[PDB]
Subunit: 189 residues, 4 copies
């Protein structure tokens, strides 16, 4: 079957007061991302929450010299934003729903995502979350190299910069040969 | 720099009433494994506890082995003075706890990433079982280009003949260095 | 449809005048290995010849083994009817030749990618040596989530003790299916 | 030490008459790409030519579309057989995917890769992202990378610097500010 990957939709990346917030454009996808996730779950798909995980003063982390402290373990910054957070409280204990700490941008890097997907004979990944040109993009490239078919939920990905969101969407379609879908998981043309 | 990998030295694998215990041969290495780990830590080495983690019906081990090392259960606790060591130094930045689901410590973990961050060129392997989790970890380290040290008195298997195969494989095929509890090369 | 992996069955590993010969036990599987390969090809399976290739100061085997399987030599040619099979059907789209530098057929190759392109879920392993290149390949396949079949009469080791450790490992640890030269499960 | 990666700078990618041609902007980096590659080689760096191999319209078939463009082809004629110079066939955009690039770099204990070639937002980007995930320091030779569209070239350069923490350098391997 299929797997939906929910990438970094947390307080720190989304909320107005978030430590490394993408701001309004990330907040704007809240309805669509929660909708498509509940739909995927209802359709029997596996759901993988792949969430940035930082410790305070990790001098070996490549991001430590680029970005201010964010998504710290045990803080409110790692909480899922909007109805997605309600969904996790309701269905997080379900065997088809996973929470996965990550340290790189890509959901595959240093995680057991690929292993879990192959156990389940998953051939298609559906990507949602933030940021379109960073974590979503890295995850998409890693999925491409690992031979997965790729679906991108257009109204359920967001970037801080609209120009970067556009580059990423074009890259998904023209380079990765991915399928762009809406919040109802129907193909867009 | 160097990293010591502590593989699956839990109650469920070592203790008498353990759900998938290796028994006496595993218990026999308790003194040596805690000594070598405390020494590695004192030498400024990074310490990685890589521990079997179970919940799931898609696991390959479900059709082979009985339930063991379940998340949250006391079966996942570290055996002997090694458990005491983790209580003391677990909070230190050089010591890590790492859940794994395959035999190899590298498979589906961020072990390689963490080692590369620290520019580690040599891994020091300890734990159980010599011919399973230790062997799988050693082969993955070999393919990832790490130099390998095996602490002979701090690895154990259920079957002595399998322990012997594994030791010979490490030396002759992987070009690993066999060392003692004092981290001195064995000849 | 499945994939058969043919590991290192060359002159230098097998032939009496080979640079690193396994001797009689490797020569003994010559009939079974070419029969099972032809059977796999006939039923539509993909065939992957994964062959050791030496040219290099930074190679890990340089300090452990004498020069063998050198590029452009007769030593890299497939032994027996297996060499005849590649002469006949090497140009077929389902038959592949890939050079490897580690023991495992997966390490630094595009084997996983090629298998995933074809939606292969099961690999069938043949060749030499059972406790080295075959074992490393099997462990990599296991970690990559493949079902594994081992053709018992078409794998060989230098020592019978090592051959038996490896077979046991495949069956008891990896959950692999042991099959005969007709690709039927052995009991 | 360091390794320079030379990505897909062939006739099909660069030349006027080649398939899937990038045209003028790709031709424009010819002087810089050969200059920086020679400098890296003279410094003792390892040189990896990672070249797409085929068997999008048909391009880079295993044919004349795989010869290295310009003075870089002359460099390879002079030093291609040196133990520090490699020719690597690839089937994905990334130079790491399905190759032994990571293995060869680890054997030599390389900590830093220097990326050159085409296209900045495709093969170069995919290679850089893989290098990041494999824990390498990254250098991008700005005047020795190119793409078809300037906006794509600028996105990729911004991504390297701001997201991956790459060092942007010039043709003399000096950091740019
Ligand atoms: Zn972060
Ligand atoms: Zn287990
Ligand atoms: Zn060899
Ligand atoms: Zn191409």
């Amino acid at each position: 079957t299929k797997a939906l990957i929910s990438i970094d939709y947390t307080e720190d990346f989304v909320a107005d007061s978030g430590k490394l917030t993408a701001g309004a454009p990330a907040q704007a996808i809240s309805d669509a991302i929660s909708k498509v996730t509940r739909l995927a779950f209802e359709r029997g798909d596996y759901i993988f929450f792949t969430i940035d995980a930082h410790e305070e003063n990790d001098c070996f982390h490549p991001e430590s010299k680029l970005f201010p402290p964010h998504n710290l373990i045990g803080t409110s910054g790692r909480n899922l934003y909007g109805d997605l957070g309600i969904f996790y409280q309701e269905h997080g204990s379900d065997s088809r729903v996973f929470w996965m700490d990550k340290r790189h941008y890509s959901a595959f890097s240093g995680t057991d995502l690929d292993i879990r997907l192959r156990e389940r004979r998953v051939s298609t990944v559906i990507l949602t979350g933030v940021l379109t040109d960073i974590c979503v993009l890295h995850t998409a490239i890693d999925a491409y190299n690992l031979g997965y078919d790729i679906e991108i939920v257009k109204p359920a990905v967001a970037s801080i910069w609209p120009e970067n969101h556009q580059f990423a969407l074009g890259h998904f379609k023209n380079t990765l040969g991915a399928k762009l879908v809406d919040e109802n998981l129907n193909e867009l043309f």
